[PDB]
Paper text:
Bgl1 catalyses the final step of in the decomposition of cellulose, an unbranched glucose polymer that has attracted the attention of researchers in recent years as it is the most abundant renewable source of reduced carbon in the biosphere. Bgl1 is a member of glycosyl hydrolase family 1 (GH1 superfamily, EC 3.2.1.21) and the results showed that the 3D structure of Bgl1 follows the overall architecture of the GH1 family, with a classical (β/α)8 TIM-barrel fold. Bgl1 has a half-life of 250 h at 60°C and it has been shown to be a thermostable enzyme with a broad substrate specificity and saccharification ability that efficiently hydrolyses cellooligosaccharides to glucose. The catalytic site residues of the enzyme are two glutamic acid residues, Glu163 and Glu361, as in other enzymes that belong to the same family.
The crystal structures of Bgl1 from the thermophilic bacterium C. saccharo­lyticus and its complex with glucose were determined at 1.47 and 1.95 Å resolution, respectively. In the case of the Bgl1 complex, the overall structure is the same as that of Bgl1. Superposition of the molecules in the asymmetric unit of the Bgl1 complex structure onto the Bgl1 structure showed that the r.m.s.d. on Cα atoms (453 residues) is 0.32 Å and that on secondary-structure elements (905 residues) is 0.36 Å. Comparison of these two structures showed that the residues lining the catalytic site of the enzyme have the same conformation, except for the side chain of Glu163, the χ3 torsion angle of which rotates by ∼30°, and a negligible change of Asn219, the χ1 torsion angle of which rotates by ∼15° to optimize the interaction with glucose. The crystal structure of the enzyme also includes a chlorine ion in the same position as in the Bgl1 structure and a total of two molecules of 1PE (also present as PEG in Bgl1) and one molecule of PEG (bound very close to the position previously occupied by glycerol in Bgl1), as indicated by the 2Fobs − Fcalc and Fobs − Fcalc electron-density maps. The rest of the differences observed in the vicinity of the active site may be attributed to the glycerol molecule entrapped between the two symmetry-related molecules in Bgl1 that induces changes to the side chain of His324, the torsion angles (χ1 and χ2) of which rotate by ∼78° and 34.1°, respectively, in the presence of GOL504. This change is additionally associated with a change in the side chain of Trp322, which is also subjected to a rotation of the χ2 torsion angle by 131.4°. Calculation of 2Fobs − Fcalc and Fobs − Fcalc electron-density maps showed that at the catalytic site of the enzyme, a glycerol molecule was bound to Bgl1 and interacted with the catalytic residues Glu163 and Glu361, but when lactose was used as substrate analogue, β-d-glucose, the product of the catalytic reaction taking place in the crystal, was bound at the same site.
Author numbering:
A (entry chain A): -4 to 453
B (entry chain B): 1 to 453
The structure:
Amino acid sequence: MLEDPMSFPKGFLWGAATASYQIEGAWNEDGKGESIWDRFTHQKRNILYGHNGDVACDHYHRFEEDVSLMKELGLKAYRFSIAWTRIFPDGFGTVNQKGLEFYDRLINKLVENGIEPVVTLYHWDLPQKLQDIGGWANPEIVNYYFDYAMLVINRYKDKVKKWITFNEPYCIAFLGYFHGIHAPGIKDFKVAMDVVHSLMLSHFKVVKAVKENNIDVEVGITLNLTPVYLQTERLGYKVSEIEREMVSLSSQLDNQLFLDPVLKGSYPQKLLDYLVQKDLLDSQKALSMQQEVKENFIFPDFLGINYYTRAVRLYDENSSWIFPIRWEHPAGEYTEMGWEVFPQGLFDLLIWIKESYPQIPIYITENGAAYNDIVTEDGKVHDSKRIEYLKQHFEAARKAIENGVDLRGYFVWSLMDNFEWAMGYTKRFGIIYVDYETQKRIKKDSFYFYQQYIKENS
Amino acid sequence: MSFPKGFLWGAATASYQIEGAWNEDGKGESIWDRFTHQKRNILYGHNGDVACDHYHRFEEDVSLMKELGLKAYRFSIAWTRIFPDGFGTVNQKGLEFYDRLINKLVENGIEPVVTLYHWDLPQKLQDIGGWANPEIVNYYFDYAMLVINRYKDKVKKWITFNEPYCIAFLGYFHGIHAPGIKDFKVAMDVVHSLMLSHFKVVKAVKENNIDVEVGITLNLTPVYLQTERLGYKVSEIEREMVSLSSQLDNQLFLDPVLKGSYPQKLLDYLVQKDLLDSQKALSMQQEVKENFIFPDFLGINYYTRAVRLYDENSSWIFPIRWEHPAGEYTEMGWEVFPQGLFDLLIWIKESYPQIPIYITENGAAYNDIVTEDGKVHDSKRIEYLKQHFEAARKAIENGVDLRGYFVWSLMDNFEWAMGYTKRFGIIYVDYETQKRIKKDSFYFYQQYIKENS
Ligand SMILES: OC[C@H]1O[C@@H](O)[C@H](O)[C@@H](O)[C@@H]1O
Ligand SMILES: OC[C@H]1O[C@@H](O)[C@H](O)[C@@H](O)[C@@H]1O
Ligand SMILES: [Cl-]
């Protein structure tokens, strides 16, 4: 007998996500200090086409129009980040009132319109003045971050009930400090590992203070997770032990390095051991890292997940990577990022978290796709592939819920086309198209699709 | 709007990829027998010792061709089956194999098209420098003329080389193909040995009034600018540097083959970057000019395009990087882009002297699964072929002298450094049993040939 389909729970947070550097512009206005991304994009050869976020989507100026679009869409929630440099131009010291006033006005406008604000405290825009003294590799950054975080939490806790300490610490550490393709452009694995640990301790400090002081907000963190699959199993071959081990270690670096500390109070020990055995990490640091996460661990209120695609990997002795593995690209649909469209990966990932970690509310804090959108003569954007991407992932999410995953919300990346970091403006993820010459917002077909989807699933 | 009368609908294979019997009947060792027998060279330690065992099973395979309704079949002759040491003693068992294959093809009304060299140089000749040793040209020529003279009554189309780009750069620069050397200057030597080898064969055929056609197969990758995809203005430096990268892929072999000179701006760039001795640049142009002869046809292997853009940070020999456009990709990580085949063919027609063109390879790798009822529902391969057939048709409609189309491949086979992990066949091969299973694409193509002939 047909029992009602499990649907999205009541109160499920259908949302859209942005980040301060990617949309705000006004990079030097009203006392805002220089961020590491201001510095990074103003230097040669770091960004495609020499693009920068000086203006971006001009959201600092046009936020009222953007909240109006959010209201039209029927978003239950909006995830955005606060620019540390608008609050503390120098990272610490004097507070910039005009920065507070911007966020006061944005947050109030959201609440007036019935949209739940969800704030990312750190989405990659460290004050350049703190980078000048080591940045995340300097242990004292932990305290400067904490002071910033508690200031904005105490200011906005009446209206903002969900706080994300960090967006994607994997990217911050390894892209910012190992690969150097993101600000601050450093290229040193051991420094990247110091950063990993600084971010964890920062996170725990904020979670601990909210709990200890009985502040009525929820604190979580956002991790990018990329489910890893074996090409050997795709081919129907037998998997060797060495391949199983090496691919698993590569998966642990992507997926468990932050998940394990955040939810279980320890780093993945096999990965740390490997990194020590390959002289990529000092034994003394591996040991102290482990001791310190255990000492400081506290369980968060929710887990945020950024999901886009999977990886398919296989053993490769000849590889120049830190593990003897190579990637394979399975046949199928790919985005302008060269990312495989693989909704099953979202389902598999969510089931894996349910089965492998203590229960915790989960939010998908980012999911979306980049297509080379064209504005038609009638001023429309017929982004049918984006619609299909989103429909399929929404259904992956539904199915996870049907299997008892505690999913409480879903934030499309992005509300609007924006500055895609080192790729500049070349990658469009919006459900709203932004003409960068005029700053006109054009609703893509995906906007109308999402609007209807929310209506039918709330 | 129709395919011309007598259009050669075909399928293509290569000796090392299908034959097996790698050391039977006195066959010499090739650089691919050596390459696959060293560790770390091929995925999963795969080798071509057995492959599809076509050496033994060719009669079944020819019946499948007949069933398919192929007008033509492109295959390669293994030099090491004919001259085990590359020169000297002629092996009769080798000759007898190609005798029987060619006879069986002709008997079934299928036109044989022979690639003389599809990458399997005798190891004995590599021992003395291979394609970098100028004497190779004469060893190759003697092999070529022997087989041409033997089979010219039944084989009217001969391809000197399959993809000299791959031979030189993948074999002698990147070293991911046999013989696994990594030296760009040696690769440029190889480029030139291949061009002179080509001209020598074309010349002897025409000079001796041998009634066959001689061509060459080049892999061509049409190149597109990400900057144009984004609707931005193109800078002069990007246009120049991406253009140089396309010339290395495309014009480096086309220009000598059809026009009798190498692309000068590329040579100049390679000289400027100490990638090519100035002296060699000069001699290359002079020697190609002296030996140039126009061929009877051009073979094109087309699979995909490249989208490129400028990158000063790049570690490649040009300051460029690739972009991956949104769309469908194959198991090779290749964009499905049938427009690239049309654009490429219009470009050949507009840029070079008129010449019959054959698509000597086109196809796609998908991760084929045999169902529980013994079928393979390769609907994506069907879609791939359908769209590329339509691009070929559009090229004809627009005045391109396209005279045939060979699907890569008749059957799943050894995909070089990827081993057996990539399946390009319209026929599935179970390597444990050597069973051939017709994929859905087999019947699609069967029907398409009947409707377009
Ligand atoms: O690359 C697409 C998006 O991926 C997310 O993980 C990041 O948080 C965003 O800042 C980025 O724009
Ligand atoms: O990569 C697929 C195919 O591409 C062609 O260019 C080559 O001639 C074949 O030997 C190869 O298997
Ligand atoms: Cl309080």
